[PDB]
Design a protein around this ligand. Sequence first.
Ligand code: OH
Ligand code: ZN
Ligand code: ZN
Length: 239
Amino acid sequence: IRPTIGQQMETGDQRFGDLVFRQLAPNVWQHTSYLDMPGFGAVASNGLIVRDGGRVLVVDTAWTDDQTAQILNWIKQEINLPVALAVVTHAHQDKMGGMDALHAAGIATYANALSNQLAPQEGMVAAQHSLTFAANGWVEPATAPNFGPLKVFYPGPGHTSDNITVGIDGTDIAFGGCLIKDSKAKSLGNLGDADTEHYAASARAFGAAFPKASMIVMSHSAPDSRAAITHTARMADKL
Ligand SMILES: [O-]
Ligand SMILES: [Zn+2]
Ligand SMILES: [Zn+2]
């Protein structure tokens, strides 16, 4: 009995080691990893895995190198294709905590130049390559070589100064990372590094950048429809 990962994922989300994987589209999966907070519920973070022909692309590490190695184990087991590159979406632990595991696997890594400046300071590792964004927010194509369907956009400061977002061309998906929370959220999570002045405008800019994305994927909520964007901006208004 040898079903494909897609065939297997019709049963629903799959637990794998300490992670959870969910198929969002035929070649797109959400990875979820958890930060144990002793005496409290574990903090979930989501990223993406994209199968782009004969290669795999990753958006965001897990919280730790070990959890990120578990992501790579899942990819080997279920997809059985090489991972070419990863894009990581700001210098917080949930997004860049596992860079060493990616680097050791021979994966080329990319982040906002600003993320690369902020990370070492915080005990993390910079990505190997720096993305530069035009004033309009779109990544300068020369700094994002061979990204396949990934379309990278800097929406402005919000959840952090360096937060970036990623659309997946040929799908209904755009990844807001930690900038966006779902349409029922009671808070924006930890705002300790947030730009409270600009957050709402940056959430709006993300929505305007990916107007055809009907599935919004987020770090700290399950996927939602576009109402998540204005809900997030409403929650962020006049912080
Ligand atoms: O975060
Ligand atoms: Zn963050
Ligand atoms: Zn986060």
